[PDB]
Amino acid sequence: FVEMVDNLRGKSGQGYYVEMTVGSPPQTLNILVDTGSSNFAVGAAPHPFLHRYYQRQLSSTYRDLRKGVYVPYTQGKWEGELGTDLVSIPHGPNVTVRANIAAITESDKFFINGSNWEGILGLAYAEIARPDDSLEPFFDSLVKQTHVPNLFSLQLCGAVLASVGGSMIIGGIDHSLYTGSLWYTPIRREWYYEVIIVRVEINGQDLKMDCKEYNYDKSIVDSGTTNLRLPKKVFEAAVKSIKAASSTEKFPDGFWLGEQLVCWQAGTTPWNIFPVISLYLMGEVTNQSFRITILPQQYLRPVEDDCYKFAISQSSTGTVMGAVIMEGFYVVFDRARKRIGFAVSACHVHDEFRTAAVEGPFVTLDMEDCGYN
Numbered sequence: 459f460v461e462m463v464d465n466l467r468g469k470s471g472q473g474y475y476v477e478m479t480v481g482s483p484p485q486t487l488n489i490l491v492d493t494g495s496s497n498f499a500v501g502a503a504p505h506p507f508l509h510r511y512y513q514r515q516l517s518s519t520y521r522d523l524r525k526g527v528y529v530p531y532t533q534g535k536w537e538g539e540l541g542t543d544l545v546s547i548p549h550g551p552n553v554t555v556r557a558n559i560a561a562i563t564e565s566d567k568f569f570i571n572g573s574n575w576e577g578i579l580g581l582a583y584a585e586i587a588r589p590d591d592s593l594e595p596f597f598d599s600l601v602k603q604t605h606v607p608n609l610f611s612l613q614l615c616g617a618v619l620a621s622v623g624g625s626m627i628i629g630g631i632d633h634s635l636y637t638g639s640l641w642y643t644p645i646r647r648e649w650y651y652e653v654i655i656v657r658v659e660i661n662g663q664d665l666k667m668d669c670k671e672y673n674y675d676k677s678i679v680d681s682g683t684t685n686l687r688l689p690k691k692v693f694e695a696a697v698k699s700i701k702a703a704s705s706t707e708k709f710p711d712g713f714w715l716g717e718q719l720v721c722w723q724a725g726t727t728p729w730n731i732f733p734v735i736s737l738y739l740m741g742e743v744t745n746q747s748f749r750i751t752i753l754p755q756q757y758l759r760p761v762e763d764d765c766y767k768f769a770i771s772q773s774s775t776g777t778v779m780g781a782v783i784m785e786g787f788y789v790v791f792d793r794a795r796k797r798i799g800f801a802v803s804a805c806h807v808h809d810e811f812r813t814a815a816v817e818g819p820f821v822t823l824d825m826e827d828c829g830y831n
């Protein structure tokens with residue numbers, strides 16, 4: 459899949475995008491890769507923040523669905539007009555499909571002033587598509603109309619604002635992109651990429667919470683989120699324990715809340731005083747789990763003296779495994795088998811003493827009880 463390796467770009471904190479073409483003749487757009495939503499929606503008007511936009515009037519293969527779509531979400535909104543058109547991915551499989559496209563005609567806090575992308579590719583399932591589950595998501599269209607296998611994988615590698623890179627392998631797995639074995643956790647339900655966390659440790663010390671708290675009201679794998687977001691009660695316990703383990707140095711409460719930065723003399727960041735963080739995920743087998751472990755190199759994010767933000771934050775919408783988790787791992791979205799694979803990423807940032815890890819098997823009882831209903 460060498461043609462697809464390194465097909466993602468971005469700027470730090472502004473997400474990962476892939477090149478796509480829409481319409482005939484082809485119009486090239488940079489599109490945000492989002493496993494946390496399910497619409498293919500593209501800027502369709504000259505918003506001043508956009509480098510380019512979909513000009514439906516220039517496409518011979520454009521079809522109007524004569525229906526609007528309205529998409530408020532927690533940090534913004536977008537609105538638009540539904541249609542279909544032909545779509546390809548230049549650094550993806552050699553195929554062209556007819557996909558649903560939402561031509562974005564009004565928005566608020568959706569486009570980023572300074573980014574290089576113009577649309578969003580929602581890779582999640584129809585159940586959370588707007589306006590309803592009858593709007594077939596892109597990837598469903600791709601799989602139905604071609605012989606592209608029903609799976610994709612992401613290697614997110616991270617870095618005035620640093621450029622980031624990664625790979626979206628569409629229709630398979632590139633084994634060069636990880637070390638060790640893949641370990642799979644079941645997709646609990648096909649809406650978000652919902653998973654179940656069964657145990658949490660900070661430097662091997664169990665938080666000892668009712669595991670339902672870890673997944674209240676859901677836990678998801680989300681390439682469209684930067685932080686590791688945790689339910690409020692879990693965040694409180696996690697920070698208490700991370701404070702304790704790192705107490706060699708003291709920081710203000712605002713650091714832990716993301717309200718301020720911490721800085722060290724360039725090149726002297728004391729990675730060693732910060733603990734590793736492990737999430738045990740439901741495994742493939744009854745009473746079997748595995749654990750994924752990240753380093754402070756994943757959860758202390760550089761802000762451009764070396765200065766960092768604490769990139770674990772609280773959530774009222776459940777655990778969100780964003781870039782802080784995904785940049786440690788090669789992640790396989792094995793839609794065909796309703797499961798998500800994690801393996802140590804060949805590009806993850808680490809040091810001489812510790813590495814991001816994926817380890818198993820472990821015995822964990824009552825894992826089904828950890829899910830919220």
Ligand SMILES: COc1ccc2c(c1)[C@]1(COC(N)=N1)c1cc(-c3cc(Cl)ccc3F)ccc1O2
Pocket residue numbers: 471472473474490492493494495529530531568570578680681682683684
């Ligand atoms: C209905 O759900 C929606 C709808 C729209 C929507 C998003 C979700 C969102 C927010 O979280 C996720 N996963 N995608 C989302 C995320 C981002 C975004 C993602 C990253 Cl990784 C970084 C910066 C961003 F602004 C930009 C736009 C954006 O729009």
